[PDB]
Write a protein that binds this ligand. Structure first.
Ligand SMILES: Nc1ncnc2c1ncn2[C@@H]1O[C@H](COP(=O)(O)OP(=O)(O)O)[C@@H](O)[C@H]1O
Ligand SMILES: Nc1ncnc2c1ncn2[C@@H]1O[C@H](COP(=O)(O)OP(=O)(O)O)[C@@H](O)[C@H]1O
Ligand SMILES: Nc1ncnc2c1ncn2[C@@H]1O[C@H](COP(=O)(O)OP(=O)(O)O)[C@@H](O)[C@H]1O
Ligand SMILES: Nc1ncnc2c1ncn2[C@@H]1O[C@H](COP(=O)(O)OP(=O)(O)O)[C@@H](O)[C@H]1O
Lengths: 67, 436, 68, 443, 435, 445
């Protein structure tokens, strides 16, 4: 963690770099009922969705965690 | 802080000098070498004045004669906040950095920038937190009661403070510190309420604290170069920082110095075993000393008229004459029996070892016979033999047992030379069978 | 811990530093994939690669790898 | 039944309480003074006060130098760390040898930490998210919160999850009816398995069925961990374990060794000193063993001169079998055991001696006892005479072909004819050299 | 106060208007012919017409070569690029040495750009976007202590505004030409909406909302080559954490250099730019391989090559990378055929005394005249650099005994404490065990 | 412009007749008639283009004109023909093998010629109207574009509509669309709207509105080397490797496929093959492996004509332990033809110095020219060539517009040549660092 005492711009920049919505949306997926809500009850087409599901799958179910 | 077991130079707390730069016979763990200590005090005043830059000082002498200990005394007498980079000679032969780049990074880690800034903090003990939330969480109303030993207050809380308080969960009786601008809340622990443990703060709640930062030039060079972030200061893969960013940093530091926003502090770069460097490193050092942003370089070597690395000729101290022309040489001497006895006494008091007087005389005799470091090493293994037979003070026969068990160099060379058929020679010829 | 002076005088633009001016000068005005100044190179590269838009090289050359 | 390989007949130094070595106990025969010196070194390591001490084991080939180091490692116990090295392992193509030596130096300092974990666990019963106002607003995620209903034994809790926690939740592919395990220290989620309260035999994904967790959903537990300083160094150098973008991308890239700067080591030392001062940590220094030390060159020796003078470095044990050999990386210097004199001045040499006929005979007897073979007395005398005549190792390695040749003749004992046939079938170094001298076309 | 490091008593060549060197001028003592030749070279560089001209100045150690090069750099001024270099810096482990040589060649050709900086700053009082899902424009009304100002903005700047999370009452910073948006903080008028808050509060700007300024940008061709040849891609303005993939140096092709030259030549003809060639200075030129010496012959025949200045202190020495090639100054004869050689002569006693007095004056030290002749005799007996480096221990030892003037006892004490190379060598020969 | 007066910029082609007979002084070249005739023969061999894989060797003493001859061949070759000029030290790379670097240098010197047609509609967008069907399966577009003279209405396909959503237009941006190809680009904003939005932004740029005919027809001709095709087909986005050099050992199967498709395009008639010249200056620092690779690579059909220049005597071949003529092995010299060069005399030196003084805008008197000619007879030629330009600055500092004998004498006294420096080193060698590292610093013994 890098801190600058008495500045709010550095906190916003660090929170944008660590938790970038585009990359974090690329490394995950939207829930199914949320996808149904935006595609049908909001009129958003499928091609205007953010990119999801680019995390590579592990070998097993056991290989997905360190606990 | 600064965890450490016991070092080989842990008994040295600094140079033993008075106000007139004269060495005491025994002070701050240093015994003997009065001329070397006086010269190192002059170099210390050279560093502390800070009005000149780029001077080379060579410390040369026989092995195991106070060479690294002088540098440790200088570094201990320098104090905090002044940089001190201590590298070895063979450390600059990298695989992803050139030798001149590694030398430049070692040079620019010894110049610091002093910046003073003031912040506002709120530190106190939490009395009561009252949070009112809606069903959907669209709005939240908050009241926080916080106190010190001298005042009590209640704050009306905003949305972002409420979200920053439910994160990093705080309860009653905690002692916390809040920065208003950045929103960072640090839990310092719990107060003295049994119902880790930290005494309640006193005085005003909102204090104005000024902190003084010391940032090396290499950190600004890494940060200003946009190819890698600040994490390269820890991972170490900076990877050949260019020169235009260094020029920009130099011009900006010179611009900050005129307006009083920053101060230049110089440090000491210590290069132990300087004879291991290559000729190209010497040629880079010949021009790196002629810059305004250059520290004071201390080099140590024990070679006498050795072959310069990367060449085919022999040079004094293993260094070419161009580097020796730019340097002033401090020479160390060998020790008498009284200096060896005093050093062994200090090393005995450092390791919490009780020595008898006859054992000290035997250790001094076998120190002036073979080496100082052998007799220094014998004490800690003689103490285990003393403790094995359930005795506290180290006696004569314990030192004799340690002399019998662990060999020195001169006995091992003779034992090798009498039985040369049992060891592998330079031709790879050995004999393993006993008979024939 | 980083001092505030370094951040406000070396990263963010203000009235006394030229971060934004030099950024626009190096990355936009003097870019060799600019169709306003290097249309022949863009046409040659579009014939070579088969791209249907001549602004694709300027777009590709100024984005990070992960976003690309 | 069991696997034996050139060792494992040795269980320790075999000393009494006064440090006096017995003639034959603990799997050792002879070498009384070296074993007593190694016992003194073992007591010095167990004192846990010194730093940067070093000894050197000097002797001929096949005399018991590696055996003494393994006996030291067995006498210390498994809690004290022990890092065995060969001299050829320090030359890597990814990073310089100096960093590899410092890595092996930091790999031999242990630490024991009592660690407290905040744990939410239970069975997932309700998994309900709710949406944002403008999902295509560019900034902010698609959802805002996720409601998770957890049920444990004698308890039930509901949680409103942050989306960042929900990324790790949905990366584990949890569902309704699964027993999960959330670690609040790092945000890591472990999916244990399907609950056994529902049916079992209607699955096709070979899952594991687990009962409900005992106790409440929210817990705090204390865990004792064993961690070396090098582990902390490589954890902070390549950060994997967060829930951010950088920590997520750190697990997918190919790992590579990097030159860890001294600033990170100073920060790790400061944090470990704070942990020790808080009373939750205990420092366990160890032993670094570098066998075949003559393979090192002058640069690693010169860096080792500096590295032994730090205040953290552990006890270093070296070994060599050279008489008067030029140091590698030099041209004309000559030093005992291939070790330069400035490094020799900081050592404590432990001499090792060759064996006799009777010691060879009882070593052969014990190694035949370990390998579960029955040897006749005349065959044992012939094997001892062969060991004196050629090599101890040659008489050691001829036991198992003799056992195979005895077993092919439907016998249990080993007799003289099997030893003669193993002599005729298998050769030693001297006879092969004598054949090569009287050879036709470089045989 | 002021830091002096082996130089900075040199402010120029000390020539007159006719190019004749005065004896003591510009901090230079003696050395008339080398200073006059360097003045001729300075005039040739200021002519700005020729490409690839190379000179070499050779002499003994500690004779004034690097001082002459820095005097040339001081004579040319700060607007002319000057790239110092040592010969050992060309051996990098990331790219070949010829690529590094071409990089240092193109680092010494500069450009001058006339630019205009326009800045709006102040408190936001109105933020009304207008559409025609796509915003047509946005109207922003700023406010400072001298009044208000209402601006229209395209949606591209509006996307950067909502990137910065800007609401009503924040103090912002908008650059007109580049479109940069920076949020400074919330205004002090909204500091009492809550007792405890996360936002930081700043006062109103006391100046006007609209500010204009004329600036001059100095760049080199190497900066444009680097900016056009990023291998991974572009970068954002703010990146506190680096890229996940490490970008190393690459062998930049000739085609990129040709395209950069074409773009710069197009921009020069409109009067936007101005081309200033500079000096590439390489010290210790005898530490170069024969391959770099061969590639220097090709690089010196280009159309854009700057003036190259080399230094060497070797005699008849074997070239590095060869076995049986003996050439003067460690420089191969095919290269030697392409330069002009300037000889640099040593010093006698009185110039050594005068240089010692000059360095004592610069370092703010007072030396008695009795100690000055002893220091000059010491300098003639051992080395000039040994006499120059002994001034500060003498000053410290004089200041220790509460004296502000150098007394010859301090010079004797500093001679006793610190040795030179010859006495240390005599200790080395008359010793038993490794000094 | 971005070109200063280089070492040999006065040479514009070989000074030859129509019967390949060299004139004594024409096109900036003086003397060397046999080498000029041989270079004319090689130039006609290149211009014929039916002979592939020939190696010639320009050998001579230093400062004779081998690189001047190569520059003259390059200038007389004309444009749109690839002429690669590399040194011998450039192929020792860290990310590429010497074989791969030599293969890339070989394939950079042979190209193909492609001609295409363009129907450019360049203008400023006035207003765009999009018609969407009720089903939504197709989108219709009415585009109103204009120049400064006239304006028309165009109907648009759905691919135009999706291509104009990307790099979006805002009714006043200058675009240019092809008819047959349909390439879409956005040049920037018009100058008429420069006082509208009060702040420019990041990517925007202001261009003038195009004038005249809206629909233009233009034929352009491209020349692409084979190496560019290799780099393009090696990756997914290959032009970044074309401009940053990060190709990294392209495989052989893509080269075979590219050779086969080049032969197929030549047979069809889409493209024609333009050969070229590869010039390897200072060939004597190449390894023996590079020489063997050159021996094998010279026998392929897609090989250029290789020009090699060297000035070594009987010297050691690098990578071996023996000596050889020109520093080259004998099997490489077998498959080659040698053009030799001869040293100059007083008159050709005087003519070369006069031409170089004419090029550098320096006026000399006759006596100064004769003094420089005598110096170039005694010393080398490049010494006098540098003496001219420094004597010009001395004369300008003397407030005179002409260079006289006193300025030449002052420049002779100030700047030394090789022989005087050798004599001065050999007279005072105790002050210089010799090969053993011994030097005397102090002046008093
Ligand atoms: N004057 C002194 N005071 C205290 N300890 C000393 C002194 N001189 C030498 N020593 C001790 O002798 C040992 C060798 O010193 P050192 O200078 O490190 O060896 P070397 O000369 O090989 O560098 C050190 O452990 C140091 O503690
Ligand atoms: N005192 C001993 N008692 C029993 N076995 C021994 C003894 N000394 C050596 N050995 C055996 O001799 C072999 C060689 O010893 P080791 O130390 O591994 O190699 P070296 O002596 O060549 O370094 C080992 O397999 C070990 O089992
Ligand atoms: N004419 C002069 N006047 C004043 N100082 C000089 C003069 N000549 C040399 N010096 C000084 O003597 C030193 C010589 O250093 P330098 O020129 O770098 O040595 P070298 O010529 O071996 O590179 C410099 O510190 C310079 O300040
Ligand atoms: N025939 C010629 N006509 C005009 N100039 C020449 C001629 N030959 C040589 N030169 C000039 O001599 C200078 C050096 O010749 P160069 O070609 O470098 O010799 P080399 O071929 O031995 O390297 C060049 O600047 C060139 O202009």
């Amino acid at each position: 963690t890098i801190e600058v005492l008495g500045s709010s711009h550095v906190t916003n920049s660090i929170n944008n770099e660590l938790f970038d919505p585009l990359i974090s949306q690329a490394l995950s997926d939207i829930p199914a009922i949320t996808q149904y809500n935006m595609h049908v009850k909001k009129g958003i087409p499928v091609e205007d969705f953010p990119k999801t599901g680019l995390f590579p799958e592990p070998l097993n179910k056991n290989f997905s965690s360190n606990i | 802080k600064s965890l450490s077991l016991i070092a080989a130079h842990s008994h040295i707390t600094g140079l033993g000098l008075d106000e007139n730069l004269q060495p005491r016979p025994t002070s701050e763990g240093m015994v003997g070498q009065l001329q070397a200590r006086r010269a190192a005090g002059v170099i210390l005043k050279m560093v502390q004045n800070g009005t000149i830059a780029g001077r080379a000082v060579l410390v040369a002498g026989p092995p195991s004669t106070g060479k690294t200990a002088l540098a440790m005394g200088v570094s201990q007498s320098l104090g905090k906040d002044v940089p001190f980079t201590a590298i070895a000679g063979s450390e600059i032969f990298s695989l992803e950095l050139s030798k001149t780049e590694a030398l430049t990074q070692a040079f620019r880690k010894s110049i610091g920038i002093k910046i003073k800034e003031e912040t506002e903090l709120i530190e106190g003990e939490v009395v009561e937190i009252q949070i009112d939330r809606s069903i959907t969480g669209g709005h939240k109303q908050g009241k926080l009661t916080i106190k010190t030993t001298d005042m009590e207050t209640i704050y009306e809380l905003g949305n972002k403070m409420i979200d920053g308080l439910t994160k990093e969960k705080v309860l009653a009786g905690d002692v916390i510190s809040i920065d208003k601008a950045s929103g960072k809340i640090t839990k310092l622990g719990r107060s003295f309420a049994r119902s880790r443990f930290v005494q309640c703060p006193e005085g005003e709640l909102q204090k104005r604290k000024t902190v003084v930062h010391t940032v090396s030039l290499h950190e600004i060079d890494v940060i200003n170069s946009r190819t890698q972030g600040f994490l390269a200061l820890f991972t170490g893969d900076t990877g050949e920082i260019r020169s235009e960013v260094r020029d920009q940093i130099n011009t900006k530091v010179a611009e900050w110095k005129e307006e009083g926003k920053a101060e230049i502090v110089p440090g000491v770069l210590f290069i132990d075993e300087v004879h291991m460097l290559d000729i190209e490193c010497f040629s880079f050092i010949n021009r790196a000393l002629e810059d305004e942003f250059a520290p004071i370089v201390m080099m140590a070597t024990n070679r006498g008229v050795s072959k310069t690395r990367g060449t085919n000729y022999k040079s004094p101290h293993g260094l070419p004459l161009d580097l020796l022309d730019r340097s002033i040489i401090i020479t160390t001497k060998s020790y008498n029996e009284q200096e060896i006895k005093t050093i062994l006494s200090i090393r005995a008091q450092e390791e919490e070892v009780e020595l008898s007087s006859d054992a000290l005389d035997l250790l001094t005799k076998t120190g002036v016979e073979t080496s100082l470091r052998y007799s220094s090493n014998l004490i800690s293994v003689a103490q285990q033999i003393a403790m094995k037979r359930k005795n506290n003070t180290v006696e004569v026969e314990d030192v004799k047992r340690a002399y019998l068990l662990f060999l020195d160099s001169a006995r091992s060379v003779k034992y090798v030379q009498e039985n040369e058929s049992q060891y592998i020679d330079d031709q790879g010829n050995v004999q393993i069978s006993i008979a024939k | 811990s980083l001092p505030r002076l370094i951040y406000e005088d070396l990263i963010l633009p203000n009235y006394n530093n030229d971060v934004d001016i030099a950024n626009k000068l190096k990355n936009v005005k003097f870019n060799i994939f600019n169709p306003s100044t290097n249309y022949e190179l863009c046409l040659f590269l579009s014939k070579l690669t088969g791209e249907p838009s001549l602004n694709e090289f300027f777009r590709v050359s100024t984005t990070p790898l992960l976003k690309r | 039944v069991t696997r034996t390989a050139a060792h494992t007949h040795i269980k320790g130094l075999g000393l009494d309480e006064s440090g006096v070595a017995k003639r034959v106990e603990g799997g050792f025969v002879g070498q009384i003074e070296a074993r007593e010196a190694c016992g003194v070194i073992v007591d010095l390591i167990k004192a846990k006060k010194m730093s940067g001490r070093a000894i050197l084991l000097a002797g001929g080939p096949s005399t018991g130098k590696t055996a003494l180091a393994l006996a030291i490692s067995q006498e210390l116990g498994p809690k004290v760390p022990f890092c065995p090295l060969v001299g050829s392992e320090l030359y890597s193509v990814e990073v310089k040898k100096t960093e590899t030596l410092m890595e092996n130096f930091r790999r031999a300092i242990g630490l024991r930490i009592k660690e407290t974990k905040e744990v939410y666990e239970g069975e997932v019963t309700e998994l309900t998210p709710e949406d944002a106002e403008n999902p295509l607003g560019g900034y902010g995620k698609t959802i805002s919160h996720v409601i998770v209903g957890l049920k444990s034994a004698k308890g039930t809790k509901t949680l409103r999850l942050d989306p960042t926690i929900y990324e790790s939740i949905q990366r584990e592919k949890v569902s309704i009816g699964d027993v999960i395990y959330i670690e609040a220290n790092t945000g890591a989620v472990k999916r244990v398995g399907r609950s056994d309260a529902y049916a079992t035999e209607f699955d096709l994904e070979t899952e594991e069925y687990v009962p409900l967790p005992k106790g409440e959903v929210h817990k705090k537990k204390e865990i004792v961990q064993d961690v070396t300083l090098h582990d902390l160094d490589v954890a902070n150098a390549r950060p994997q374990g967060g829930q951010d973008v950088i920590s997520m991308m750190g697990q997918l890239l190919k790992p590579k060794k990097t030159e860890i700067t001294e600033k990170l080591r100073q920060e790790v030392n400061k944090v470990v000193a704070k942990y020790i001062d808080q009373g939750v940590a205990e420092l366990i220094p160890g032993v670094l063993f570098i066998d075949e030390v003559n393979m090192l060159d002058i640069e690693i020796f010169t860096y080792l001169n500096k590295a032994l003078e730090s205040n953290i470095a552990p006890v270093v044990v070296l070994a060599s079998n050279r008489g008067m050999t030029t140091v590698r990386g030099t041209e004309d210097v000559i030093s005992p055991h291939g070790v330069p004199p400035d490094l020799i001045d900081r050592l404590l040499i432990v001499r090792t001696l060759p064996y006799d006929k009777d010691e060879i005979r009882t070593i052969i007897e014990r190694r035949a006892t370990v390998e579960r073979l029955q040897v006749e007395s005349s065959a044992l005398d012939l094997l001892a005479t062969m060991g004196t005549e050629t090599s101890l190792r040659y008489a050691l390695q001829l036991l198992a072909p003799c056992g195979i040749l005895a077993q092919t003749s439907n016998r249990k004992e080993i007799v003289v004819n099997d030893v003669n046939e193993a002599k005729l079938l298998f050769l030693d170094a001297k006879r092969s050299t004598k054949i090569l001298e009287t050879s036709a076309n470089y045989l």
